[PDB]
Amino acid sequence: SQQVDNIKPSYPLFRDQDYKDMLAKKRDNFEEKHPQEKIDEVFQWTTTEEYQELNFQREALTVNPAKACQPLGAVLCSLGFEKTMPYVHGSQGCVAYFRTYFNRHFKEPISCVSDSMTEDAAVFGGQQNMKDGLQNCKAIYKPDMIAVSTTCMAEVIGDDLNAFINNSKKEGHIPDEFPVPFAHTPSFVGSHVTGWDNMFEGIARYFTLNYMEDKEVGSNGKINIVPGFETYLGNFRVIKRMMNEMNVDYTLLSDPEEVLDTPADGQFRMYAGGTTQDEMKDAPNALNTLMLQPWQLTKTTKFVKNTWKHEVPKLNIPMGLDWTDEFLMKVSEISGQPIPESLAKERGRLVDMMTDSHTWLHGKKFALWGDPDFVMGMTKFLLELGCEPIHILCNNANKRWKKAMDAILAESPYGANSEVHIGKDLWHMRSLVFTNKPDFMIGNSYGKFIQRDTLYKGKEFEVPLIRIGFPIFDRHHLHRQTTLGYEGAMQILTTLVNSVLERLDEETRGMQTTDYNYDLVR
Amino acid sequence: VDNIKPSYPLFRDQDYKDMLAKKRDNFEEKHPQEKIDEVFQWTTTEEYQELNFQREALTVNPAKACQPLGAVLCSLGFEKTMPYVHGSQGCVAYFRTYFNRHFKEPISCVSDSMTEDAAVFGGQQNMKDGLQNCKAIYKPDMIAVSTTCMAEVIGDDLNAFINNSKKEGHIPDEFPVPFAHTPSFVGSHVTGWDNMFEGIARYFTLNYMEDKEVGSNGKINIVPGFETYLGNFRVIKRMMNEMNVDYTLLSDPEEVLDTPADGQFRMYAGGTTQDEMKDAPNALNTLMLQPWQLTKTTKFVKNTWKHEVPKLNIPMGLDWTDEFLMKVSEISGQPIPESLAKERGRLVDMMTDSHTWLHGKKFALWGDPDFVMGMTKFLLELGCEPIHILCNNANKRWKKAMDAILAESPYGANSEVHIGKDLWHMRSLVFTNKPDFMIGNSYGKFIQRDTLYKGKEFEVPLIRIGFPIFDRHHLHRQTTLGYEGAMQILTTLVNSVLERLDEETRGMQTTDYNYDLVR
Amino acid sequence: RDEVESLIQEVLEVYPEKAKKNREKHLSPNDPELEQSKKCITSNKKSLPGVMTIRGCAYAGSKGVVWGPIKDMIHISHGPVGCGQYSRAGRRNYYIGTTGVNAFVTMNFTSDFQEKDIVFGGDKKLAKLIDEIETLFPLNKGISVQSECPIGLIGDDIEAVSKQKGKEHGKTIVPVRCEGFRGVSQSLGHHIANDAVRDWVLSARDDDDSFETTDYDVAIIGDYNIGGDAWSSRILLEEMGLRVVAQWSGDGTISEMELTPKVKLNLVHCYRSMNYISRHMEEKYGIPWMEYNFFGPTKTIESLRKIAAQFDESIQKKCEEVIAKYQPEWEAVVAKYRPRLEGKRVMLYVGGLRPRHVIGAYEDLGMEVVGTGYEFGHNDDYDRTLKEMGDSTLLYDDVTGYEFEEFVKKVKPDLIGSGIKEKYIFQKMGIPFRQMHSWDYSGPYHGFDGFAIFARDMDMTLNNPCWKKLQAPWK
Amino acid sequence: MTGMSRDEVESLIQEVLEVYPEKAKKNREKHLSPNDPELEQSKKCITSNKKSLPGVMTIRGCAYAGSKGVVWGPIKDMIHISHGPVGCGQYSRAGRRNYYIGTTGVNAFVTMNFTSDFQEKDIVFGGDKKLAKLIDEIETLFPLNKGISVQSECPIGLIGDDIEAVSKQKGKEHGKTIVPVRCEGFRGVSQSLGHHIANDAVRDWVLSARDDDDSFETTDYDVAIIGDYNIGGDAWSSRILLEEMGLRVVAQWSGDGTISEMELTPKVKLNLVHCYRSMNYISRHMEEKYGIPWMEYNFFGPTKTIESLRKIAAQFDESIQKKCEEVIAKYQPEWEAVVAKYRPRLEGKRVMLYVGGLRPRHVIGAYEDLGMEVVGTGYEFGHNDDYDRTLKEMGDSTLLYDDVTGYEFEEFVKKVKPDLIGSGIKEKYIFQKMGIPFRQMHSWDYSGPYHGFDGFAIFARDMDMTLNNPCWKKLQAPWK
């Protein structure tokens, strides 16, 4: 039943007694459900150390991975270039998932096309799909550039992207001069951040590899910045803002912030902003290139060092306090531009907030997951805050990354109780937060199911989720936030301390039981 | 060790529970828990609310401060200016502590420590010694004098006292000592800000109007009023800079309330210069960011500076930020840049992206008159229903304007505006006509505790927007003005709905359906 | 209307000659007097390469749509990590259970294929994975292996692994060859998933008559409980005196599917996804199946009476009792919201059922559907749409991103109902948008209780203040 | 490195005094002095309890803060009216962390702000009629309150209001205890006079309520905790130790205190005074009238706690003394583990303290139990007897500052260079900007309790957390 002035959505509607009786009858008569005592016993078992041992012994089954596949990262990289259409050579189901995935995180239109390879292309190849798809995409959406990646189907059948695109231009389906950079992005290798790295390297080598003769390092007086797979708009904005503050000429290659934040003013903009082809062409002329996320940009770093002859600095992700200092000083050294007093004031304000909030964050235990560079930066900032990241997880990191993380934790007294897990999913994380409970989780929206599980064991066992990372689906406009620089550190610091304070208020709201310590002032 | 428990988990141990139970049962002579429960249930009913709204002498949990607090904040907005409260020192200790806990920053303010001796002979000697000591010790460029209620009750003449201090050599004749009478039994803290600003503006410009020409410096004055969000000062400056509009933000405390921690303490930082105040009558116009709390300043600026002072609402939400930008554009002749149109469009895009989770949501809000009016206007723009609009400071004129704003919107039909009511009135309102959320300062946390105690389904979560915020950190850095402020408010509101929904749907096998990954 | 054909001609000029000639077959005005939609529109063909098609794949239609909602079964996304990750908890097929213990819908079980699995096969990895599932999730009641694209390309044999492991563990393991390249859309995923149900689950209790049966046993087929849609439909059916033995597949169990061959009537809500299993059950067990529509009071009342006519007079008497009981509720909803929605025009584009099933609900609020289309509807889907849509009204099969935008720019509807991939495109243009797949995370919309939510949601979005504020006042 | 010599401390005192005007410098010179442990009377080295100099950033509050904020407000079952304009009650609302157990708004009212909210009509024509009507509304809307206190703010004593007459009439009318407190903020020089006024209000209106009442059963081990305000549960950590010793804590006020506990105090055998400054007035009265001995005790740090517990137990029979050794032995491993964990990370650190009237000397033993040295201390409103007790508890040639100004305390810190500063919220953010770790000695930085053995673990954790926090090593920008 529905009251016209109290219309209930699904959650309060099905908690009505008539729906409760229906569901109980359905469960008891037809569902053949396991008895609730057995269900409770099994759930209690899944929270124990014995279950965790079996959980971590598995080698074939992945449960709730914290990673995506390569072409998703390639699409995001392609979206960072001016009037560029992401084009995934392969099956159309992948593109529908890529677009939907980015739709739900950014709440924005996501432009990406497939050439709809089917069972016929499984035996004959996707050459005809490439010729028709490139011609149709150019004719319909009129991009200045088509960036081609691959689905796993095209990779498994061994389609030659270079030959297919060359044959498309020779047979007149697209002009010979039309830029069609390509990258093989196999989804059974690496993760989405690997696809971003491959796509950027493909675009960079498309525009510069055969034109290195007239290039001179430092002739345009700029600094290239490669962000990598980045889903926070504020991270693109904070880097540009800091470079403008230092009066440092820069080129942000793969800049998607404009197209991922178009205004709603009565018009739809398929394209907005993005790195121009002239910017990519002139990139070898820069003084240097900075990898914002060096752990996911190894193929790009190898290409830039070997082809552009840029001495890419060994810079960490500019996260927290120390690494933002190192990034700013490295930018200052390369460009010769002094760090302005405004940035020193911003750093001092971040230090002031660190001082103001240190009592509520010291000793706080965190389990975190995400992409390798974000996780490393988050761990570094947590150590700077006196927090203990006790469960550091990265589904898509290698052993070299784990070695660097262990060195970072060894440098800090607050990393002594820390364990780094690589190649582990969020079902592994669920075991970790049950057996060695942190105060909070830092991760994407998939951690909400871990919080539900820990709450089900008990309120005193619930581990609240702090939503930092990708993807964020159950909150709105968090993609506008910043995690890089002093501004990003301030936003992270404010989120962390107020998560502690909000959790403490929830624990102390109980009248006459915990309402002492329900302090007005914290 | 390894589990050192602070107060909350420590006293929940069984040994402390047994101790507290024995203490209550043997010595406290407490009312029986059944009677306590019965009385609490009574205080949540409509019958209690009618008695609650019938009181005329008792105020319970007010949502306002006293005038000198606003005067101190206004004084802090001027360059190297020491707030100086003529009166008893207990007021200044409270003013500094109040601002210390909200801004998490040092707050400079001095008292002349008027005591029982000054209750009979006046505070003239305290003024002479205090001005001399304050100048010699802290070396301000300017001393802004307000009053505690003690000095106002005994009728101390600020003008005569400061004049006698200069005549007898305790301070130089040319040293600027603006003053304002700020009686705490009149108005509220925002009234003190208005009085202090009018006193400073009058001090620097009233006797120097002869050579002033309106619009000769080509700038626009901005008077923010009592503002405790650093981002509000920042957003106004940023918007004027991107419009290439020359402006003068009078009473700009942004820098001194956000000094960096770099091994040095800065008692003074930034602030409106005395030349800026002196040249203010030469501006094209003056804009009151919070016109309802700036009436005395508005009257002075219109009648002395001969500035038109357009009837502008607070630049909050979408419509009123549009009006502010178009009024700035009209006065300065500078077109609104495409960057601001893009920022407005992004705010509209977020309004579109979040409208399904905000439509129909019921809010009880309180705070200062202009912030409440702007919050109500933005809530109506979002399709939300502000059902309990409370303002302890506002007059009947403000209530009339709010009723007109609500009458203009179909989402204001179920709205009631309360003036002269405190947060105990608000507690009854959220019990008898329950909103989904309350927007207010940290004092609302006790209302949430009460509504949770009645039941989880009755709990009204508090969204912390306003002043003061004591139980959260660095919220004073955020913005409520402009498109950026509207975006921050929207993000806070929609994610408060989503976080509350996740809390209600986290229960495994009971409400874990609708615990959606995608919202 | 010649005007609609003129619009179709104008949007067609952008395409190259080969792409254009293909697309004219998929756009046509609606002719209610036409009996066969083959003579006006063409469907279920291959998507043109290089266009922003909205369609998914066979894996999305099998794992996402049919198998995934089965709560007591673990569904392995067999292959690389991508497909299972993007489809994890994305459909809102509601269920009741303890996730990770006896329910696994919002979970992402995957084999996470690496290069070694692509090069040397993943049959051994699949066998090991099933063992790990048995150890770590012992309360699962069955396992499905949803093949992603590489599985059918590297020559893996998941049927042999499923057979051996099912006998070894005494479990039902369903190999589904739903490789995303197999068809042209999610539609073939429905057929592959339905055949997997028939070949591995449906005949489990053929020689088992222990389940007690009544004359009023029904099974809901093709209702995936989107926001509790099947629960809102089930309460109406059981208030009518019927016993809903099974529902496919939202909130469904493996045992419910095994009990379906014992019902008296199969109520098919989504014909497109589950007509395969309904025809098989009619030919094998003799169970009649009928299509029903619980969108809006008018369709719900008609379907309830049509269902009750399949039983004795006692059920028909209870049907009039249910209709009378809910009559004040939906009449109050209409009285409240029809004045705010009367005359508004809607353009719809959903998958294989909703482009035509929701039309009556819109017409109950005074609204008019001035255009509709299917991502993967067949000719029989468009046959059903012809009479449910007004004359000279736009129909678009497998509409591209460009075509749908151009149609909206000309038709100018007051509301668009479509998927998440076009939600934010038309919100930029200032047209109110309602998600017709996830119900914009609201719902349910089925039954009488769902109609109140539907009318509230249409009113909330269409009449939202945000839509009057897209133009800057100074522009 | 040796601590500052006496000569260097006087030299530092002279330098800070230079910028003062001559009249101000002469006054301030009497309030700064090196510590002389060999000195018996602090009058000959430092001067206290004088008027604050005008125009200086004094940290002191007012008599209203010392009466309403300190003594009366923590009484949970009583409603306390901030009689006057809205400001005083608003700034003191829930700002102290006097912990209590109750249903707020029903039977407990500590974090509540009851005020008469004076307007100009109440200033001009008086607020006695408004106060009478206000008390009626309190009775109607809060019927479970067990008493009412009228805390006068500054205008009450200036406009000639008569709150004693209103309180007497309304108390008879409602059968309720109404305590008029003339704690107008201008009356004294600090919160200290607020303590005396509040104590006299307790004596004149509450303490005699059961003089002819003997129904309450009494034991030989009855004690009352006087002047413990349960800051973060301080009195609860102290009470558990006393009752483990076999004592019965009949009364504790004001922290978590009730009006009935205050009325039961004249029936105890011993009055344990933690804060002498705020409650020595009522303790002397109870000794002179009821013959109850009172003794000062210190539960800061294990060394002071053990000494105090043994000294308390010596006031009773051997059974209490035996239980005292059981309590000391039971908690010995707990605080020794705390010392073993945190003393290595705090040994040799130097701390400067500045709190109101008790904590500048009471917390010194806890710091010394952690290996730390207090190189400077001072009082906002401590009297000469407060400084008498500090002399022996404080190191030789150590800076002492009475009613220190904002300038003076900053200049002292710049020269002494302490590793840690313990002071109020008005000094917390000044010294954190200078890069010196700061701990609030009033609110315990919203941590605590610090009393007793359980409080010592929190205290050592808090000192280590702030002093050794990584934030302090990053104050300087690397490029600067």
Ligand code: ICS
């Ligand atoms: S199954 Fe089909 S696309 Fe019939 S794949 Fe799709 S939950 Fe649509 S129009 Mo999403 S044939 Fe169901 C459908 Fe309709 S996922 Fe749902 S809304 S009624």
Ligand code: CLF
């Ligand atoms: S059409 Fe469908 S969704 Fe596409 S792959 Fe094929 S079954 Fe799957 Fe999968 S991991 Fe990523 S998303 Fe693909 S490239 Fe492969």
Ligand code: CLF
């Ligand atoms: S010394 Fe003390 S705190 Fe000061 S007034 Fe006097 S009793 Fe009170 Fe009150 S309302 Fe505001 S804060 Fe004052 S100016 Fe008056």
Ligand SMILES: [Fe+3]
């Ligand atoms: Fe958006």
Ligand SMILES: [Fe+3]
């Ligand atoms: Fe600060």
